[PDB]
Amino acid sequence: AQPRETWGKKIDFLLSVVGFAVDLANVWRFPYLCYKNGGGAFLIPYTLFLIIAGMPLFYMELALGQYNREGAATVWKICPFFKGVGYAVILIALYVGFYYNVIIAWSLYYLFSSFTLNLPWTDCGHTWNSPNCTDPKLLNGSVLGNHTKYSKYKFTPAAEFYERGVLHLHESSGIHDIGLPQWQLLLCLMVVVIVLYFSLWKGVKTSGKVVWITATLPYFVLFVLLVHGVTLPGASNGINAYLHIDFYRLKEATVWIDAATQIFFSLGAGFGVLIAFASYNKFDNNCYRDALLTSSINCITSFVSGFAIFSILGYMAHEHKVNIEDVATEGAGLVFILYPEAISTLSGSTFWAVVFFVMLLALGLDSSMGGMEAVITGLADDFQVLKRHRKLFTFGVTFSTFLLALFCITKGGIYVLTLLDTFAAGTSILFAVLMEAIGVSWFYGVDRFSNDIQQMMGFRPGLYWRLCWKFVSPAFLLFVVVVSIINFKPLTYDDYIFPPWANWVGWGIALSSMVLVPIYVIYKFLSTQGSLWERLAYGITPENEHHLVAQRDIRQFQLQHWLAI
Amino acid sequence: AQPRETWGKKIDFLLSVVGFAVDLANVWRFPYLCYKNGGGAFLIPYTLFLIIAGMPLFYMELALGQYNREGAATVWKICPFFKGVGYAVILIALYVGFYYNVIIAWSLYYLFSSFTLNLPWTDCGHTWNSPNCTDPKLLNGSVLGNHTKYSKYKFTPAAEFYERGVLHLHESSGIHDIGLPQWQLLLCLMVVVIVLYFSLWKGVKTSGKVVWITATLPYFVLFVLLVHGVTLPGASNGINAYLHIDFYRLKEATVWIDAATQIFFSLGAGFGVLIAFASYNKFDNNCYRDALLTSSINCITSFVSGFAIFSILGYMAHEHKVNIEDVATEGAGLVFILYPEAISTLSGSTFWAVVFFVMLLALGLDSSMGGMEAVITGLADDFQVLKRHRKLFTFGVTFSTFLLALFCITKGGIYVLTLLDTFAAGTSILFAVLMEAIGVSWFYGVDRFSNDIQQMMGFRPGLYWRLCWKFVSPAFLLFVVVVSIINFKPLTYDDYIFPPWANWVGWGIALSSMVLVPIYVIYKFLSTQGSLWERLAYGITPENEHHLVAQRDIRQFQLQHWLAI
Ligand SMILES: CCCCCCCC(=O)OC[C@H](COP(=O)(O)O[C@@H]1[C@H](O)[C@H](O)[C@@H](OP(=O)(O)O)[C@H](OP(=O)(O)O)[C@H]1O)OC(=O)CCCCCCC
Ligand SMILES: CCCCCCCC(=O)OC[C@H](COP(=O)(O)O[C@@H]1[C@H](O)[C@H](O)[C@@H](OP(=O)(O)O)[C@H](OP(=O)(O)O)[C@H]1O)OC(=O)CCCCCCC
Ligand SMILES: CCCCCCCC(=O)OC[C@H](COP(=O)(O)O[C@@H]1[C@H](O)[C@H](O)[C@@H](O)[C@H](O)[C@H]1O)OC(=O)CCCCCCC
Ligand SMILES: CC(C)CCC[C@@H](C)[C@H]1CC[C@H]2[C@@H]3CC=C4C[C@@H](O)CC[C@]4(C)[C@H]3CC[C@]12C
Ligand SMILES: CC(C)CCC[C@@H](C)[C@H]1CC[C@H]2[C@@H]3CC=C4C[C@@H](O)CC[C@]4(C)[C@H]3CC[C@]12C
Ligand SMILES: CC(C)CCC[C@@H](C)[C@H]1CC[C@H]2[C@@H]3CC=C4C[C@@H](O)CC[C@]4(C)[C@H]3CC[C@]12C
Ligand SMILES: CC(C)CCC[C@@H](C)[C@H]1CC[C@H]2[C@@H]3CC=C4C[C@@H](O)CC[C@]4(C)[C@H]3CC[C@]12C
Ligand SMILES: CC(C)CCC[C@@H](C)[C@H]1CC[C@H]2[C@@H]3CC=C4C[C@@H](O)CC[C@]4(C)[C@H]3CC[C@]12C
Ligand SMILES: CC(C)CCC[C@@H](C)[C@H]1CC[C@H]2[C@@H]3CC=C4C[C@@H](O)CC[C@]4(C)[C@H]3CC[C@]12C
Ligand SMILES: CC(C)CCC[C@@H](C)[C@H]1CC[C@H]2[C@@H]3CC=C4C[C@@H](O)CC[C@]4(C)[C@H]3CC[C@]12C
Ligand SMILES: CC(C)CCC[C@@H](C)[C@H]1CC[C@H]2[C@@H]3CC=C4C[C@@H](O)CC[C@]4(C)[C@H]3CC[C@]12C
Ligand SMILES: CC(C)CCC[C@@H](C)[C@H]1CC[C@H]2[C@@H]3CC=C4C[C@@H](O)CC[C@]4(C)[C@H]3CC[C@]12C
Ligand SMILES: CC(C)CCC[C@@H](C)[C@H]1CC[C@H]2[C@@H]3CC=C4C[C@@H](O)CC[C@]4(C)[C@H]3CC[C@]12C
């Protein structure tokens, strides 16, 4: 029974949680969601939502970890009925990791496509990009007017290299005929998973330095990019369009849901990564300051990434003689299409391409590292046999992720990636964070967690924190869940409609998770010896307090536990 | 540490080894291989080969089990360097099981297609069979002459129901585009794996009664079939063609290899099933009588199945006014095409169809049961944690087999089935039995095994048995391996050529096995503490004798061990 591991320094934990919080969603989703939702008028609700969805929950997780010093699965020693919930989130993270690795591979491919004087996305002619031959001309070299949407036009050299050069989507038609995995993407995925294994194979020692590097790099990259972009012609128009405050859209009821989803999927609240990272800190560490600093750093990073991206977009629109809304897009398509074009247009395309691709690689690597570390920590604290042998279990996890990401990098693997991401991430992690909030706030109690924090840190959390823990956060999570359930639309690509069975498979994965949580609750209720009341007491009370279950002193049965605010 | 399990009676073990020995290869491959290779002139070498490939090896396995009372993996306590060999065979069996389950499902489908007054294979018109519409007429109702081969003609109602009604091969083009698994085949596979799990979930208690039933049924089915067939017109010509002795072909050098492969793949010598079944017998049980009776029963069953099948073929050729060689075929296509046609032609098609399909179902079930029981016994004797919890491990094995058989029952799953069967079975099990023979006969010794048998049974094996164990069987296995390696041809279906990468994947699986055996030998050589000679001694000597490794008394180092015959 070796003692629990600890970080070398708290700066390592801070950089780890920052790298987990900072993601490509801050780069490709926050700017577009901000500009589309009235610019600055998007921020006024966003930060507000951010505040709640950032301050208690994150804090809670950290505090929870600092009080439990265990993984996301075994953290439910105060309420075993929700322990399976942790299991779910682990699988959830695992699921995410799969397609996330795919994204990383893409960046790595572009990295291997960045060492040349004539980049593939510059011109046409089978220059490392499969020529569709259906008018693969220069982007807008001949004519002045871009009639259709720039992102919708699929005959630009950047888009041709994206969907044909690396993805090879032309060789597939959908999820019914996906084909075989590509070999160069296979090698890129091999390199990615090998780096991840060599980073996470030995506790939290080397991973600290790795997240140090992958945190120090992207901020410098963004700084250099914005410094070079503010001097570019036309970037001022893009920046002004990004910060244009139009308070009219706030009542549209769509600027709130988008901001809530963006904050929830960017900050990482409710995920096992936070508990896993907090399970290695000191017992007297201040989780409040750490959570606040992480949220502030995440928001500032999102804002500066939006500034830089929209400066680049304004420069490109000036070069393309079009409006900012035409070039405005979001996602992997957005980056991999528009950024290489502006880089090739700028002087020294090699340096900018290399630095942008290495920033994306570092971000993806640190995010997948945090997710896989959470998975490993949870499954190790759950089964002590896995905690002893960490290298072999890490190798097995990396190999399973590699096999499933190979399944997902096929000719039609973008459809499987979208399906997994949308269905699994949204539904599963929403239900998981809702169950976790309900368990920690109501079933366990909001005063016991405050007393635990008072034991860890000298000051006791105020009334606002408890009220947001018990009422505001659960209601917000339930609202987001109901919105995601009602607003569900059939899966659709750019121009490809998904057959009905793909949506049913996605909902089947989501239902697998949200019955495995009840499957575990039923297993716990049945595997206990006693009557209805005694089984319920053993299920809703902490294990270390199970003795008072026999003493007829259950606090949850009384009503003072429920109304403790 | 619960004691080792034992059979309720030795009749259970006998029926189990008979059911494992009796397979559909005796039904669809032995008759065609016999008739094609000069009829009775096929038997003269066959039985001879049979004798060797049946008498010592089988016996050896049984005796080995009776001396070890463990699985196929852990049976190498006398030579740990070959223990990984056992691992291989386990995986090999597992591999086989996958596609084997597919075959079982097929029969089950035909079973669910046997309860009707107008059977699907009788007539055309979308009668439970997908009509290709390219002249799907009556078989030979209009015309008298069958120009092309009857089995090659793909527009007969039986063939239309086979390749389109259940397999749905028209909806696929090869292994590159396989598609999604079919739902009715999915349900049939579910039923099959559920029956297998309910049979093998509790030791060797219920499996005894299950193999009792699945042994008592097929012999009665074959008896009724032959009794009804000897009275049919034209069956005498088919029987005479089957038993026509033409000693001219014996020098063609092809009637020997086919007989050797048929015996080796029908008797099951070198597989883990024999060791697993012998690991539950009494220490004083006679393995010689059991092996001899099993070989004789297998040969007689093959002969009577050939008699009945060729009587049916002669009757059908009389009904079709063609020669016996035209209707003569082999395999799942042979049975599922020709037998339903003759059954529909006969009176009371329902009874004959039901009894034939239930015989095929029983055979497939008992064979897959033996294979999965071998796998479970090996992996349980290897890891004691799995021997304790047998139900959960059996469920996991059945679920993995179910998932891979679902992968193999897709629209193009027949190609994957052929690939797996040919490559995996042939190459892997040939290398495995060669390594096992070399280990038990040369590295361990042929006199020590004889002394072990003398300890188990009063009489000591004669000189012929030891000479066949040490020289004849290893040379025969090496000959078969060399023939299989040299005569390797690219994978080809009826009319579909396989792309090169399918053959490379098959050879990659075979190489995975035949390096995992050296991978284990290298792991054993490296994980030992000592110099070259001490490591080699600890690797080539029994564990219970490892003490004399320190006493410098290794017998294998001397030459008297090698020439002990
Ligand atoms: C289906 C299978 C397909 C692929 C099969 C792949 C086979 C497989 O399982 O490998 C995964 C991984 C191997 O790791 P790896 O390939 O990197 O091999 C070395 C080994 O792990 C050493 O222990 C390391 O020394 P140390 O730790 O720094 O002192 C050395 O690191 P370094 O010095 O060069 O930097 C490593 O190079 O697992 C284990 O660790 C086994 C040892 C168990 C515990 C190790 C004892 C610490
Ligand atoms: C990914 C998962 C997807 C599917 C998950 C599928 C769920 C799963 O995990 O299955 C595993 C396996 C399935 O078998 P099954 O569920 O049928 O077993 C049940 C029960 O657990 C008893 O083991 C059975 O024997 P008994 O009659 O009571 O004696 C009883 O049989 P019966 O009542 O029908 O006759 C059954 O009710 O369950 C175990 O056996 C655990 C060992 C417990 C040992 C208890 C006895 C030794
Ligand atoms: C990466 C996959 C993520 C999920 C991992 C779950 C593994 C698991 O096994 O869960 C079993 C659980 C009850 O069994 P356990 O909870 O594990 O038993 C516990 C144990 O023995 C621990 O060692 C001790 O500390 C706990 O006290 C036991 O309860 O049943 C369930 O909810 C269905 C979950 C099955 C998951 C299958 C995936 C579809
Ligand atoms: C239990 C967990 C860890 C196993 C992994 C589940 C995931 C990775 C598996 C389960 C079901 C699988 C999907 C089932 C449906 C299809 C159809 C095929 O045409 C495209 C691949 C695709 C989309 C599969 C991709 C991988 C998949 C989503
Ligand atoms: C020009 C392109 C490649 C960007 C270069 C980024 C790399 C080279 C820079 C960016 C930020 C840098 C980090 C920022 C500051 C520190 C803190 C110091 O205590 C250790 C080194 C470390 C961690 C630096 C390492 C090198 C670093 C990661
Ligand atoms: C690197 C330059 C060009 C861009 C500026 C990026 C800023 C926001 C980032 C990048 C590197 C980061 C520094 C690297 C690591 C350390 C050491 C430790 O004590 C924490 C603060 C400090 C000093 C970080 C502060 C924030 C930091 C300076
Ligand atoms: C939204 C973009 C601009 C980044 C967000 C920056 C703003 C919104 C963030 C950064 C620093 C944050 C503050 C940090 C400190 C505190 C004190 C705490 O007791 C309540 C929350 C509060 C008041 C935070 C509110 C939100 C905050 C002001
Ligand atoms: C492709 C994937 C599935 C690889 C398989 C995962 C393997 C490598 C992982 C998963 C679980 C791990 C095991 C969990 C615990 C133990 C018990 C210990 O006494 C021996 C090591 C062993 C057995 C670990 C070895 C490695 C292991 C088997
Ligand atoms: C490896 C990837 C796919 C995720 C891991 C899958 C999980 C659910 C499975 C796969 C292998 C399993 C482990 C294999 C080995 C052991 C040792 C045993 O004494 C306790 C259970 C335990 C610890 C299992 C727990 C659950 C386990 C970790
Ligand atoms: C571990 C995860 C992958 C569990 C996966 C369960 C999913 C992949 C499986 C289980 C049951 C399956 C469903 C059962 C039957 C139908 C009806 C038909 O309309 C096809 C889709 C649909 C709805 C299947 C889709 C795939 C499905 C939902
Ligand atoms: C409690 C746990 C087990 C699961 C609870 C989640 C519930 C709310 C899930 C389970 C099944 C899900 C449904 C499955 C599929 C569909 C059909 C689709 O056209 C609209 C969404 C809808 C209707 C989903 C809505 C959300 C849903 C009803
Ligand atoms: C290690 C063991 C247990 C894993 C199982 C191996 C088998 C079942 C797997 C591994 C490699 C797989 C094959 C390799 C790729 C293809 C090509 C595709 O067009 C059809 C499926 C097919 C033919 C796969 C079928 C299933 C397969 C043969
Ligand atoms: C369905 C039809 C066609 C097949 C009939 C099944 C017959 C052949 C099989 C099934 C079960 C078998 C019986 C199972 C058990 C016993 C008890 C034993 O003391 C004598 C043999 C006897 C009686 C077996 C004889 C053969 C048997 C009756």
Ligand SMILES: CC(C)CCC[C@@H](C)[C@H]1CC[C@H]2[C@@H]3CC=C4C[C@@H](O)CC[C@]4(C)[C@H]3CC[C@]12C
């Ligand atoms: C099923 C019958 C009528 C058709 C002919 C098949 C015969 C030869 C098969 C089928 C069932 C078999 C019998 C069923 C089981 C037993 C009980 C055992 O203690 C002695 C062998 C004996 C008696 C078997 C002998 C061979 C057997 C009789």
Ligand SMILES: CC(C)CCC[C@@H](C)[C@H]1CC[C@H]2[C@@H]3CC=C4C[C@@H](O)CC[C@]4(C)[C@H]3CC[C@]12C
């Ligand atoms: C008809 C064919 C297909 C089946 C083969 C049956 C014959 C060839 C087999 C079955 C039973 C066998 C015999 C069974 C018992 C013995 C021991 C002794 O007496 C000499 C050889 C001898 C070892 C075997 C010779 C070969 C044998 C006669």
Ligand SMILES: CC(C)CCC[C@@H](C)[C@H]1CC[C@H]2[C@@H]3CC=C4C[C@@H](O)CC[C@]4(C)[C@H]3CC[C@]12C
């Ligand atoms: C491969 C997939 C599809 C099937 C699932 C495999 C499962 C069912 C099998 C494989 C290995 C088995 C485990 C190995 C040994 C142990 C240790 C014990 O303390 C709990 C039971 C447990 C954990 C077994 C439970 C069932 C188990 C996990």
Ligand SMILES: CC(C)CCC[C@@H](C)[C@H]1CC[C@H]2[C@@H]3CC=C4C[C@@H](O)CC[C@]4(C)[C@H]3CC[C@]12C
């Ligand atoms: C489930 C089927 C496919 C078996 C094939 C996979 C085999 C090789 C794997 C899967 C699950 C694994 C087992 C999972 C659990 C344990 C418990 C641990 O303390 C010893 C190793 C042991 C026993 C593993 C041994 C190897 C194992 C059985």
Ligand SMILES: CC(C)CCC[C@@H](C)[C@H]1CC[C@H]2[C@@H]3CC=C4C[C@@H](O)CC[C@]4(C)[C@H]3CC[C@]12C
């Ligand atoms: C199935 C498991 C047990 C192991 C299987 C290994 C197989 C599936 C893998 C491993 C390495 C792979 C090979 C690697 C190299 C090439 C190059 C290409 O020009 C033909 C395909 C081919 C030959 C691949 C075919 C599939 C392959 C052989």
Ligand SMILES: CC(C)CCC[C@@H](C)[C@H]1CC[C@H]2[C@@H]3CC=C4C[C@@H](O)CC[C@]4(C)[C@H]3CC[C@]12C
């Ligand atoms: C000892 C273990 C590791 C494996 C034994 C090596 C032998 C038996 C294996 C390893 C590589 C295999 C070869 C791989 C693929 C080919 C090319 C094909 O066109 C003919 C068969 C042939 C030539 C295979 C023959 C069998 C083979 C030579």
Ligand SMILES: CNCC[C@H](Oc1ccccc1OC)c1ccccc1
């Ligand atoms: C929140 N910033 C990291 C984003 C988070 O990263 C993960 C990456 C890999 C594995 C697990 C991850 O988390 C569980 C995520 C979650 C859901 C969808 C996409 C991305």
Ligand SMILES: CNCC[C@H](Oc1ccccc1OC)c1ccccc1
């Ligand atoms: C020998 N009479 C049984 C045949 C044998 O049956 C098995 C079936 C399922 C799993 C394992 C099997 O054995 C390992 C086999 C072996 C190789 C290829 C096909 C068939």
Ligand SMILES: [Cl-]
């Ligand atoms: Cl953000």
Ligand SMILES: [Cl-]
């Ligand atoms: Cl035979």
Ligand code: NA
């Ligand atoms: Na983020």
Ligand code: NA
């Ligand atoms: Na990141």
Ligand code: NA
């Ligand atoms: Na046989």
Ligand code: NA
């Ligand atoms: Na059989």
